[PDB]
Each structure stands twice: as structure tokens, then as C-alpha cells.
Design an enzyme around this catalytic site. Structure first.
Site, PDB file in Angstrom:
ATOM      1  N   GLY A   1      80.928 -45.428  -4.419  1.00 33.26           N
ATOM      2  CA  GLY A   1      81.874 -46.489  -4.758  1.00 33.26           C
ATOM      3  C   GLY A   1      83.113 -46.488  -3.894  1.00 33.26           C
TER       4      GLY A   1
ATOM      5  N   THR B   1      86.134 -47.029  -4.949  1.00 38.65           N
ATOM      6  CA  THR B   1      87.126 -46.299  -5.756  1.00 38.65           C
ATOM      7  C   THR B   1      86.750 -44.806  -5.819  1.00 38.65           C
ATOM      8  OG1 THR B   1      87.652 -48.307  -7.046  1.00 38.65           O
ATOM      9  CG2 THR B   1      88.296 -46.166  -8.052  1.00 38.65           C
ATOM     10  N   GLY B   2      85.497 -44.516  -6.186  1.00 39.61           N
ATOM     11  CA  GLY B   2      84.965 -43.162  -6.288  1.00 39.61           C
ATOM     12  C   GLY B   2      85.157 -42.374  -5.009  1.00 39.61           C
TER      13      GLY B   2
ATOM     14  N   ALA C   1      81.325 -44.552 -12.038  1.00 48.27           N
ATOM     15  CA  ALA C   1      80.497 -43.358 -12.221  1.00 48.27           C
ATOM     16  C   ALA C   1      81.287 -42.214 -12.878  1.00 48.27           C
ATOM     17  CB  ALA C   1      79.908 -42.906 -10.891  1.00 48.27           C
TER      18      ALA C   1
ATOM     19  N   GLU D   1      87.687 -18.153 -10.460  1.00 48.81           N
ATOM     20  CA  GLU D   1      86.442 -17.377 -10.466  1.00 48.81           C
ATOM     21  C   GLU D   1      85.257 -18.134  -9.864  1.00 48.81           C
ATOM     22  OE1 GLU D   1      85.747 -15.182 -14.287  1.00 48.81           O
ATOM     23  OE2 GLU D   1      83.914 -14.482 -13.288  1.00 48.81           O
TER      24      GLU D   1
ATOM     25  N   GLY E   1      86.808 -44.125 -10.887  1.00 49.43           N
ATOM     26  CA  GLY E   1      85.802 -45.167 -10.679  1.00 49.43           C
ATOM     27  C   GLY E   1      84.760 -45.240 -11.781  1.00 49.43           C
TER      28      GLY E   1
ATOM     29  N   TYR F   1      71.894 -45.956 -17.166  1.00 49.33           N
ATOM     30  CA  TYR F   1      73.023 -45.068 -16.904  1.00 49.33           C
ATOM     31  C   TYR F   1      73.263 -44.114 -18.088  1.00 49.33           C
ATOM     32  CZ  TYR F   1      74.472 -47.275 -12.452  1.00 49.33           C
ATOM     33  OH  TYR F   1      74.550 -47.735 -11.157  1.00 49.33           O
TER      34      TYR F   1
HETATM   35  N1  GTP Z   1      74.794 -41.160 -12.500  1.00 43.96           N
HETATM   36  C1  GTP Z   1      75.556 -42.247 -12.407  1.00 43.96           C
HETATM   37  N2  GTP Z   1      75.800 -42.782 -11.211  1.00 43.96           N
HETATM   38  C2  GTP Z   1      76.505 -43.940 -11.284  1.00 43.96           C
HETATM   39  C3  GTP Z   1      76.999 -44.567 -12.414  1.00 43.96           C
HETATM   40  N3  GTP Z   1      77.585 -45.778 -12.081  1.00 43.96           N
HETATM   41  C4  GTP Z   1      77.435 -45.861 -10.782  1.00 43.96           C
HETATM   42  N4  GTP Z   1      76.800 -44.775 -10.235  1.00 43.96           N
HETATM   43  C5  GTP Z   1      76.538 -44.512  -8.816  1.00 43.96           C
HETATM   44  O1  GTP Z   1      77.781 -44.479  -8.138  1.00 43.96           O
HETATM   45  C6  GTP Z   1      77.745 -45.348  -6.987  1.00 43.96           C
HETATM   46  C7  GTP Z   1      78.585 -46.579  -7.243  1.00 43.96           C
HETATM   47  O2  GTP Z   1      79.985 -46.202  -7.275  1.00 43.96           O
HETATM   48  P1  GTP Z   1      81.105 -46.591  -8.465  1.00 43.96           P
HETATM   49  O3  GTP Z   1      81.822 -45.411  -9.025  1.00 43.96           O
HETATM   50  O4  GTP Z   1      80.351 -47.323  -9.592  1.00 43.96           O
HETATM   51  O5  GTP Z   1      82.219 -47.616  -7.970  1.00 43.96           O
HETATM   52  P2  GTP Z   1      83.785 -47.595  -8.249  1.00 43.96           P
HETATM   53  O6  GTP Z   1      84.277 -46.193  -7.931  1.00 43.96           O
HETATM   54  O7  GTP Z   1      84.058 -48.006  -9.643  1.00 43.96           O
HETATM   55  O8  GTP Z   1      84.367 -48.705  -7.277  1.00 43.96           O
HETATM   56  P3  GTP Z   1      84.094 -50.237  -7.585  1.00 43.96           P
HETATM   57  O9  GTP Z   1      82.588 -50.351  -7.877  1.00 43.96           O
HETATM   58  O10 GTP Z   1      84.497 -51.038  -6.433  1.00 43.96           O
HETATM   59  O11 GTP Z   1      84.885 -50.490  -8.883  1.00 43.96           O
HETATM   60  C8  GTP Z   1      76.260 -45.563  -6.721  1.00 43.96           C
HETATM   61  O12 GTP Z   1      75.753 -44.468  -5.962  1.00 43.96           O
HETATM   62  C9  GTP Z   1      75.676 -45.576  -8.132  1.00 43.96           C
HETATM   63  O13 GTP Z   1      74.299 -45.214  -8.136  1.00 43.96           O
HETATM   64  C10 GTP Z   1      76.758 -43.948 -13.687  1.00 43.96           C
HETATM   65  O14 GTP Z   1      77.125 -44.359 -14.786  1.00 43.96           O
HETATM   66  N5  GTP Z   1      76.012 -42.786 -13.580  1.00 43.96           N
END
Ligand code: GTP
Ligand code: GDP
Ligand code: MG
EC number: 3.6.5.-
Lengths: 159, 425, 65, 428
Positions: D134, D136-137, D12, D245, D10, D215
Site C-alpha cells: 500500500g 500508506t503501508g 492491512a 531480547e 494503512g 481478509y
Molecule cells: N493479510 C492482509 N493483507 C492485506 C489486507 N488488506 C490489504 N492487504 C494487502 O496489503 C496490500 C495493500 O496495501 P494497503 O495497506 O491496503 O493500503 P494502504 O496502506 O491503506 O494505502 P491506501 O490503499 O492507498 O489507503 C496488498 O498487498 C494486499 O494484499 C488485510 O486485511 N490482510
């Protein structure tokens, strides 16, 4: 009839008895039509404003004026269940057997609406019971399809 | 590629639709011939969302123009951006709907509906990855109302996996063509509740009030009302059209803005309210003000389930954050406590035409029940006397359809009341 | 204070300081779960389609003449 | 050989991944094209041309974020096969990520992971970078973690999880996605490092004087912490030399596998020449709640394990003197069944920062990894937000419409309730 025409239609829809009188004297057109061809008569007939119907008619309103669906004020009072207005229009020469664009006569509309007393006065005034709308339905057919037993008995005497 | 298919139906639908296209084409640098002439690459980054790429560097709106009245073809084609539209995307009838929902939904509209769907299919199938549909229409007439909702239900059965979004113009006696408007709107709301994912409630009552009470315009034309509609439409689609981390596609917007499937009727808002530079605290206060809502409902009478706010222009993003949190802290009672962090803000560097700074509000508020109560009360006044019912029954409709539409709108009103009184147990 | 686990590596060193001692193929199931979700989603969409196909029968009940 | 494969899922996961590999390159002297003018072979493979290629996989359900990697500064660092994208994202919906959209790309992702695993002669396991918030995340990560446990049964799996914060967040449904992914990943993860976006946001504002961290600012700070944790795996030290470990040193109870990371010093690059912080000063800062990666009160909790990872000009006797003071002046309570000792690691290379970046280059740095019951406060914050919405079934219709049963929400929450109880039982 410009500003007076629109104001007269507004006052007949709202039932502003004294405002209709004020506008007539000022020369508002009695048969001033609205977007759908409804004259102040049609509006008073729909909303049930008996006194306005009477003032409009005394000020030479067209009792048989047809809107764009072809409904006269008699079709509208019959549909809306205004017995007293149906009696006043009839006494002032309303067309008992007037036909709209759908083939509806005022009796068609009173039967569908289930207005028993209106059907009685329409028949008394010569409404044709054998008239058929563009669906090929008489008022008796309307009552039997609706399931209205009391009304089908009231119409069977002639039909 | 996140493509959107735009549909405009009826007189209102085509007028507000044409104005949307003129306004967003100016923002994207697209002239009436489809040529780009702007100064920024941000204008073309997400151009594909609303425009198809044509031969020799040209852009053509992914728009379908529908009407039962033929004269609508001519008026659009004669407009400033009339030539930009694909000629085979004009689907027009010849007889008209006579401000009758039944004619649009069951008679004339039913005869033209397949021809429209063929054009929808052609546009949809050419999309790399279809996001969904955007429809502009009024609820008070016959075509936009009756045929528009028939179009929605047919698109819903053919594309059940795609978002259905509408910009629906609510009728008002202050701006009224006929007394049958409450019937047409109630019959439509019933369809919208069941078949759309998200609806922007554009209330003619609120538009009239803003014009006269905010700009002192004594004789507003539809042009005066449509200036507010086009400003709002541009604002609510900002995050779909311009590079932006937040509210990227329609689905992500619907997911976060709609907690209950039937409660998808948004109260749009706009600041500053101009005519044909404000500070960040001034924009923020104006955006949450009852006087700036495009739906004639007092936000103070209900509670926000969710809020989206889009700021446009060169401004302090720190100031925006502070101001947005301040509204929530000082006015905690106007937001439901059981949806944490339910106020979302996005900032776009590009402002709209003739403005250096602007803010667009999207509220999912229980106060919108006031708009439905208003239409319901007018519907009931008319339906109790059965006034003009023959216009509908003459097209084959049954009286039960009216009773059912009335019950479902009243059920929608009671659902909003249920969440307005809900406690965070 | 006691220093145990004195491990000496190339780019580092490690140890412990003890102040006080303690007092005292599942793959088929994955396919079955994703299968269930897909069959449920289809059953949800098919029920939305039957309800819209139901309305289509009502609209054909108007253009009789 | 002892190879480690990094997986970024995803937006992030991918963007933090970009910052991590940028910092790893600078630390190991690798150019953005992979050339270098080896202990780091655990993270980088070597071609016939002398090109050093990251043992990394980047996955996203929509292409915009990975397209920036494909065309950016490091477009020649990774091979195209390592960068996987779909067409439609998960729209902040765990159910789309896990079920409907995720099922379409899972086999391709595993095939690409297998290609990297085939290049390994002693694969230790995986490092998984993703957000909790997210679609995806959350959703895709839990599906991938499930499949990796089946296909690589003996391999260790560690996570770097982005915990949501309103000051930094994109969705109202993020508390749902967080609980959903935690429930389904819990039995498939050996050790997970939570990165609270609010803690990172606070550190950038307070220590780097950045009013509005982007970001880029947040991720450069996160990569600095992630590098401090993975240095041992890349430089052959004496503490946390293998993935196994991490579990042995930090996780005595399998479900309680969420260590608190505390990093020091975070100094602004744009500030006047200051006297460098001593070992005692950076060690003292490890017990300062403001320096934690997750917001919580460790004085309210009990310690199960504690590791101190020093980098730079760090004398072992100075560390011993610093730790002695910490056992005296401060109240660090350990659970009655744990040894009470601090495990120490020292990497003598000077800490590395991105040139022109916000972080000042320091003479000595430290990352403390402590398994504390105080981290249960972060679970309680998410659970409370979940509870508020779930009591009304707000937004649940979106998940149910995307191949998920409503009962999965209840099963996930019951597991979180049991996890909160596990922490409470250890805490006494
Ligand atoms: N620290 C950090 N957090 C991030 C970043 N981008 C998004 N987030 C956080 O992650 C969450 C959003 O999830 P994402 O990973 O962007 O979404 P995804 O997994 O790509 O899924 P979709 O958005 O549907 O494509 C929120 O809590 C955001 O604050 C980044 O570059 N850095
Ligand atoms: N805001 C706005 N409302 C309009 C416009 N044109 C019509 N309406 C409203 O929409 C309704 C009439 O519907 P309309 O779309 O014109 O007719 P149709 O083609 O039969 O659907 C009434 O409630 C009007 O007040 C317009 O340009 N702007
Ligand atoms: Mg993404």
C-alpha cells in the site's frame, strides 16, 4: 434526391466514374446537397476527379453552387491544387470572383495554398487581385505574409 | 468523500451523458425527481461519488451540461431524466460550432468557456474531497471536440492536482456526419495526449460493427450505438460507485493502469453483447474477444500493458479467479512480460439492468495504435489536398497546428510500437 | 547435547540446547528532504502551468477582431 | 511496567490490528468494552473505572477502514484519540504516503504517540503493523519509522510486514512500494517479521479447507501467529521477555533482521474429533516448508539463530526429546560462527482461538522463529519484479510527480542488491 442523392455524392467523393453515370440515368439529382451543402461537383472538385466533374456538368450540374461556408466548386479546386479542374470549371462558366462566408475568392485560396499555375489561370480569367477577405487581406498580402516570393511577383503586375 | 465532477459537451457528449445518468440512476435507485426507491443500502453507500445530497432526502447529479447549440438544452430537459439535473448547471450558447474544431476551441467556444468554468468551480469547491473530472464528448464534431479540449486544458491549469478522465467518441466513416471528422479528431487527440490522465476510446467504427455484425441491426440509430456506450460506462465506473476493495478512486486506477504518461488510451470491452444467463468461462472468453471491444483494434495484433476486469452479479468468485489466470497462462504472448501480474480483476454483487451477469473489460493495449493509424491515414489523405482548410484558418488557426497534431499522433503510434516490440531483458 | 540458560518464570520456562560450538536531532535532515520534495513538486506543477499559460497566449492570438 | 506501543498503518496494518487486539482480549479475559471480571499491563493501560485500554495507535490516510473500528464491536475498547484518519489516501503510491500526503498528518500522529508514551513508566518500544504494498503501508510507515528513530533514539522498533502476493493483491506497483519502504526502514528497524500473503492464503486453503479466504480468514490466522510471537511480552515468560531480547536472540547481523516464522498446528474447527498432536509432531511440523509465514526453501539456506515458542500442555523433557530427533533425522545447517543451539520458551496457557472461527482449539501449539539465509529468496522475488518494470521506467512518472526523485529508485535497488549480497556472504 433520397437514396440516389446520397449514392451520387458517395460516387463523386470516391471517384466511381461509371457509378455516377449509372445514377444520373436513373435520375439522381445533380445538385443533391450533403450535410455541409456540398453538391457532387464540390466533392469531385476537392478529390480531383476530372472526368466526374465533366460528366456532372454535361448532366446540368450548377457550376456556381455554394455550400454552407459559401464555397463554390471553383474555391475548392483552387484550394486543393487541381489546375485541370480549375480550367474545366472556368470554361463552363465558373464565377472567378465568387465570395464565401469568410470573404475568400478562389484567388485568395490558390495564393494561400501556393498554387502558382492556378493563380496564373485565375488572373487570365479575370480574378480581381484587389479583393479583400473579411481579415482585410488581398491575395498579394497572403503571399507576402506566407513568405512566397515567386507568387508575390506573379500578383504585383496587376496589384 | 471521493466526489467526481461530470461534464458533458456537445451533441454526442450530452446524448451519451444523459444515457449514463439514466442507467446509473436506475442502478442506484434514483428516480427522475431525485428520490431514492431501491431495496439495498449498497446502492446509497457511495452515492456521493456522482450525486449531491439535496433538500428532503433527494439526490442531484454532480453534472455540468455544455453546448454551443441551444437546442441541446431542450432535448436533454425533455428526456426521461431531464428534470433530475440542476437548472443552473446547463451552460448553453446560441450560435453552434458547425462541426468545426476551430469554432469550438477558439471562437464560439472561447466565448462560453468562462461561464462553464464558473459552474465547474462551484461544484468543485462544494466537494468534501474532489477525486477529479469525467468528460463525455465526441472527437469528430466542433463543440465536444474543440470546446471540450479547451475546457480540459483550462481545468488542467486550474486543478493540476485532480484527475482528468474522458469518454471520447472516435469518428468513423461508417457513422459519419462530415469529411472534416479526421481533422477534428486529430486536433483533439493532440490535446488528450497532453492534458488527460486516462481516456476511454469509444470508437464509432467498433459500435457500428458490433451492432450490425453481432445483432444484425441493418439501420443502427445513435440510440442503438449509445446502448453499448451506456452499458460500458456503467461497467467501467462500477468500482467507483459500489462498495469495493479494488479500484476505489480514479487516481488508484490511473496509477496501476498507466505505465507511461502519454499511453493512457484504453480499449473498453463488454460482455454479454445484448440489445434494447452466461457462465463465468463464457463471460471471460467473450470479454477478451476482438468482437467485444469498443475500439476497432485487434488485441491479437498487440500486447496488453495492463488489464482491468470487472465482473458484476452473483457468481463463483473461485471460478472468476481460475478463468482469469487461465487466459494469462494459455495466452501469455498477448501480455507484456515486463509488467508482472498486469491483469487485475474485481467482482461487484450488483448486476446491470436486465442482466444477471456481466463483465467489463478495460485494456491498455499497444493494439490501440490501429485506431490512431486509421484516423492518421484519413487526416493525411485530407491534409495533403488541403481540403476544407479555410474553415480552420478562417477562425485564426495556422497550418503548422495541423502539422504539429499530425506529428504528435504519429509519435504516439510509434511509442505503442516501441513497447509492443520491447523484450523483458 | 548440553542444556544452558535454565530461566524459570511465573507462566513459563526457558533454556538452550547447544549441540556444537562455533568453529570460526536528525529531525532537521528529515525536514530538508521533505522540503526538497515539496519544492520539486511545485517546480513540476509550475512548469505544467507555464506550458498551459503559453497556449493561452496562442488562443488570444485568434480573437484579435 | 515495561510497556509496548503497537502502531497499525494503512488498511492491512489496521485490519490485522483488529484481529490481534480481538485475540489479546480473549487471551487476557478483557471484554470488548475494556472491562474484566497483571503481566498484560505491558500492552493494556488501566483507567480509574477499571477499563483496560490497548496501548495502540491506528493510522490511515483515508477514513473508511478506521470508521469500521469506530462503529464496530470494539468501538469502546480504544479511545478516539488513538484512531487517526486523513481524507485522501496514497493511491498505491509510496511517494504520496511518504512525501505529499504523509507530511500533512505526521506531526499529529507523533503527538498522539507521545500521549501514549507519557502514560508509560518504562517504555520498551514499538510494534509496527503495515503492508509493503500500500501507498500508506509503505510510504507513511517509512516516514513514521524515520521520525520515531529521532524522537525515541533508545527504543526498540519491531515490524509485522505484509509481503505482497498476486493471489491476495491490489496493485501492479506493489513491488516498487515494497523495495522503497525496505530501503528507507532498514536502518530504523531492529527486527521485522514478514508475513507473505501467499503463505497465509496457502495455509487457509490447505489446512482450513477455505477455497476463497477473505481478509477475515487470513487475518485471524495472522493474529494467531502474531500472538504466539508477542505472548512472552504479555505473560512474563523466560524467553523474549523484552523487545531488546528479540534482537539479541534472533539478529546477530543488524541488516539481516528478517526471521522466518513457522507455526503449527493449523487445524480446521469444522473437522471430526481427532487425536491431539504430540510435542514431537508439532516440533517436526516446524521444519515443514508448508507451515512457514514466508515462502522459501530453508534447505538451500543456513541458520543464524533459532527460537521455539511453545504454548499449552508442553512438557520440557518432551521438547528436549523432540529437538534431539530433529538434530538426527533432519539436515539443519548453521553458519560456522553461530552456536548451533535452539532457544526454548514455554507458555503453559491453552492456545486461544476466536469463538465460531475457522481455527480449531488445540491442546499445544508452537511458533518457531528462525533467522535463515533462505529468506533472501523472498527479497529476490520482489527485486526481480522491481527490475522488470524499472528497466522500462514503467509507472515511475507517478512517484516523480508526488515529491520523489527518480534517483531514489536506483538508491533503493542498490541497497537491496547489497542486502542480497549480505545474505550470500553469510550463506557460505
Ligand atoms: N493479510 C492482509 N493483507 C492485506 C489486507 N488488506 C490489504 N492487504 C494487502 O496489503 C496490500 C495493500 O496495501 P494497503 O495497506 O491496503 O493500503 P494502504 O496502506 O491503506 O494505502 P491506501 O490503499 O492507498 O489507503 C496488498 O498487498 C494486499 O494484499 C488485510 O486485511 N490482510
Ligand atoms: N456514439 C455516438 N456518436 C455520436 C453521437 N452523436 C454524434 N456522434 C458522433 O460524433 C461526431 C459529431 O460530433 P457532435 O458532438 O455531434 O457535434 P458537436 O456538438 O459540434 O461537437 C461524429 O463523429 C458522430 O458520428 C451519438 O449519440 N453517439
Ligand atoms: Mg485504505
Amino acid at each position: 434526391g433520397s437514396d440516389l442523392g446520397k449514392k451520387l455524392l458517395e460516387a463523386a467523393r470516391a471517384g466511381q466514374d461509371d457509378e455516377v453515370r449509372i445514377l444520373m440515368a436513373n435520375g439522381a439529382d445533380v445538385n443533391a446537397w450533403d450535410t455541409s451543402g456540398l453538391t457532387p461537383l464540390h466533392l469531385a472538385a476537392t478529390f480531383g476527379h476530372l472526368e466526374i466533374v465533366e460528366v456532372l456538368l454535361k448532366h446540368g450540374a450548377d457550376v456556381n453552387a455554394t455550400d454552407l461556408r459559401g464555397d463554390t466548386p471553383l474555391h475548392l479546386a483552387a484550394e486543393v491544387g487541381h489546375l485541370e479542374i480549375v480550367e474545366v470549371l472556368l470554361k463552363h462558366g465558373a464565377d472567378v470572383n465568387a465570395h464565401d462566408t469568410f470573404g475568400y475568392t478562389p484567388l485568395h485560396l490558390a495564393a494561400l495554398f501556393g498554387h502558382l499555375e492556378i493563380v496564373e489561370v485565375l488572373l487570365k480569367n479575370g480574378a480581381d487581385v484587389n479583393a479583400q477577405d473579411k481579415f482585410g487581406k488581398t491575395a498579394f498580402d497572403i503571399s507576402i505574409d506566407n513568405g512566397n516570393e515567386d507568387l508575390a511577383e506573379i500578383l504585383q503586375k496587376l496589384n | 468523500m471521493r466526489e467526481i465532477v461530470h461534464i458533458q459537451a456537445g451533441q454526442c457528449g450530452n446524448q451519451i451523458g444523459a444515457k449514463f445518468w439514466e442507467v446509473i440512476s436506475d442502478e442506484h435507485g434514483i428516480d427522475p425527481t431525485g428520490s431514492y426507491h431501491g431495496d439495498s443500502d449498497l446502492q446509497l453507500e457511495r452515492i456521493n461519488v456522482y450525486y449531491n445530497e439535496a433538500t428532503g432526502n433527494k439526490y442531484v447529479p454532480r453534472a455540468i451540461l455544455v453546448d454551443l447549440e441551444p437546442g441541446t438544452m431542450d432535448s436533454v430537459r425533455s428526456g426521461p431524466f431531464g428534470q433530475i439535473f440542476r437548472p443552473d448547471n446547463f451552460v448553453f450558447g446560441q450560435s453552434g460550432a458547425g462541426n468545426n474544431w476551430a469554432k469550438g476551441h477558439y471562437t464560439e467556444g472561447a466565448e462560453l468557456v468562462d461561464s462553464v468554468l464558473d459552474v465547474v468551480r462551484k461544484e468543485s469547491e462544494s466537494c468534501d474531497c474532489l477525486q477529479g473530472f469525467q468528460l463525455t464528448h465526441s472527437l469528430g464534431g466542433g463543440t465536444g471536440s474543440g470546446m471540450g479540449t479547451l475546457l480540459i486544458s483550462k481545468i488542467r491549469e486550474e486543478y493540476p492536482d485532480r484527475i482528468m478522465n474522458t469518454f471520447s467518441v472516435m469518428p468513423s466513416p461508417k457513422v459519419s456526419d462530415t469529411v472534416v471528422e479526421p481533422y477534428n479528431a486529430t486536433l483533439s487527440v493532440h490535446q488528450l495526449v497532453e492534458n488527460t490522465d486516462e481516456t476511454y476510446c469509444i470508437d464509432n467504427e467498433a459500435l457500428y460493427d458490433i451492432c450490425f455484425r453481432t445483432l444484425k441491426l441493418t439501420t443502427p440509430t445513435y440510440g442503438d450505438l449509445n446502448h453499448l456506450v451506456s452499458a460500458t460506462m456503467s461497467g467501467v465506473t462500477t468500482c467507483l460507485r459500489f462498495p469495493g476493495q479494488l479500484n476505489a478512486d480514479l487516481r488508484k486506477l490511473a496509477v496501476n493502469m498507466v505505465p507511461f504518461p502519454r499511453l493512457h488510451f484504453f480499449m473498453p470491452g463488454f460482455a454479454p453483447l445484448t440489445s434494447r444467463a452466461l457462465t463465468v468461462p463464457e463471460l471471460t472468453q467473450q470479454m477478451f474477444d476482438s468482437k467485444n471491444m469498443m475500439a476497432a483494434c485487434d488485441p491479437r495484433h498487440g500486447r496488453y500493458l495492463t488489464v482491468a476486469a470487472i465482473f458484476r452479479g452473483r457468481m463463483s468468485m473461485k471460478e472468476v479467479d481460475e478463468q482469469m489466470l487461465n487466459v494469462q497462462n494459455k495466452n501469455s504472448s498477448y501480455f507484456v512480460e515486463w509488467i508482472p501480474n498486469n491483469v487485475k480483476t474485481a467482482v461487484c454483487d450488483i448486476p446491470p439492468r436486465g442482466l444477471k451477469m456481466s463483465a467489463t473489460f478495460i485494456g491498455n493495449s499497444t493494439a490501440i495504435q490501429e485506431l490512431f493509424k486509421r484516423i492518421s491515414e484519413q487526416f493525411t489523405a485530407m491534409f495533403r489536398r488541403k481540403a476544407f482548410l479555410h474553415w480552420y484558418t478562417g477562425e485564426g488557426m495556422d497550418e503548422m497546428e495541423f502539422t504539429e497534431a499530425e506529428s504528435n499522433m504519429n509519435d504516439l503510434v510509434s511509442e505503442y510500437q516501441q513497447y509492443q516490440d520491447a523484450t523483458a531483458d | 547435547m548440553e542444556v544452558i540458560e535454565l530461566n524459570k518464570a511465573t507462566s513459563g520456562q526457558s533454556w538452550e540446547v547447544i549441540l556444537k560450538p562455533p568453529s570460526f536531532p536528525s529531525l532537521e535532515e528529515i525536514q530538508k528532504k521533505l522540503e526538497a520534495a515539496e519544492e520539486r513538486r511545485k517546480a513540476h506543477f509550475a512548469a505544467m502551468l507555464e506550458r498551459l499559460q503559453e497556449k493561452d497566449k496562442h488562443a488570444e492570438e485568434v480573437r484579435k477582431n | 511496567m515495561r510497556e509496548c506501543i503497537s502502531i497499525h498503518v494503512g488498511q492491512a496494518g489496521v485490519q490485522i490490528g483488529n484481529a490481534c487486539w480481538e485475540l489479546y482480549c480473549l487471551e487476557h479475559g478483557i471484554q470488548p468494552d475494556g472491562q474484566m471480571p497483571d503481566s498484560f499491563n505491558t500492552f493494556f493501560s488501566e483507567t480509574g473505572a477499571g477499563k483496560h485500554v490497548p496501548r495502540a495507535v491506528f493510522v490511515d490516510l483515508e477514513p473508511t477502514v478506521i470508521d469500521e473500528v469506530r462503529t464496530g464491536t470494539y468501538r469502546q475498547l480504544f479511545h478516539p484519540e488513538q484512531l487517526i484518519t486523513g481524507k485522501e489516501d496514497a493511491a498505491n503510491n509510496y511517494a504520496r504516503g511518504h512525501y505529499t500526503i504523509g507530511k500533512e498528518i505526521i506531526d499529529l500522529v507523533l503527538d498522539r504517540i507521545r500521549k501514549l508514551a507519557d502514560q508509560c513508566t518504562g517504555l520498551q518500544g514499538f510494534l509496527v503493523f503495515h503492508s509493503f504494498g500500500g501507498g500508506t503501508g509503505s510510504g507513511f510507515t517509512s516516514l513514521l519509522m524515520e521520525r520515531l528513530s529521532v524522537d525515541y533514539g533508545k527504543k526498540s522498533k519491531l515490524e509485522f510486514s505484509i509481503y505482497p502476493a498476486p493471489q491476495v493483491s491490489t496493485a501492479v506497483v506493489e513491488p516498487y512500494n515494497s523495495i522503497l519502504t525496505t530501503h528507507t526502514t532498514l536502518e530504523h528497524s531492529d527486527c521485522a517479521f514478514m508475513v507473505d500473503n501467499e503463505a497465509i492464503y496457502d495455509i487457509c486453503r490447505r489446512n482450513l479447507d477455505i477455497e476463497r479466504p477473505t481478509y477475515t480468514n487470513l487475518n485471524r490466522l495472522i493474529s494467531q501467529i502474531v500472538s504466539s510471537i508477542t505472548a512472552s511480552l504479555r505473560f512474563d515468560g523466560a524467553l523474549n521477555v523484552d523487545l531488546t531480547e528479540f534482537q539479541t536472540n534472533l539478529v546477530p547481523y543488524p541488516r539481516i533482521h528478517f526471521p522466518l516464522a513457522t507455526y503449527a498446528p493449523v487445524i480446521s474447527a469444522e473437522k471430526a474429533y481427532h487425536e491431539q498432536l504430540s510435542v514431537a509432531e508439532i516440533t517436526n511440523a516446524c521444519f515443514e516448508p508448508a507451515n512457514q509465514m514466508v515462502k522459501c526453501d530453508p534447505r538451500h539456506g543456513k541458520y543464524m539463530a533459532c527460537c521455539l515458542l511453545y504454548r499449552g500442555d508442553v512438557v520440557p523433557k518432551d521438547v528436549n526429546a523432540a529437538i534431539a530427533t530433529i538434530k538426527t533425522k533432519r539436515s539443519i545447517q548453521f553458519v560456522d560462527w553461530c552456536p548451533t543451539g535452539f532457544k526454548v520458551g514455554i507458555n503453559y496457557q491453552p492456545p486461544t482461538v476466536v469463538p465460531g472461527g475457522d481455527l480449531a482449539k488445540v491442546q499445544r501449539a508452537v511458533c518457531m522463529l528462525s533467522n535463515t539465509t533462505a529468506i533472501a529468496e523472498a527479497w529476490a522475488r520482489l527485486d526481480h519484479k522491481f527490475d522488470l518494470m524499472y528497466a522500462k521506467r514503467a509507472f515511475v512518472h507517478w512517484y516523480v510527480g508526488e515529491g520523489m526523485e527518480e534517483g531514489e529508485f536506483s538508491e533503493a535497488r542498490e541497497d537491496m542488491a547489497a542486502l542480497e549480497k549480505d545474505y550470500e556472504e553469510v550463506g557460505v
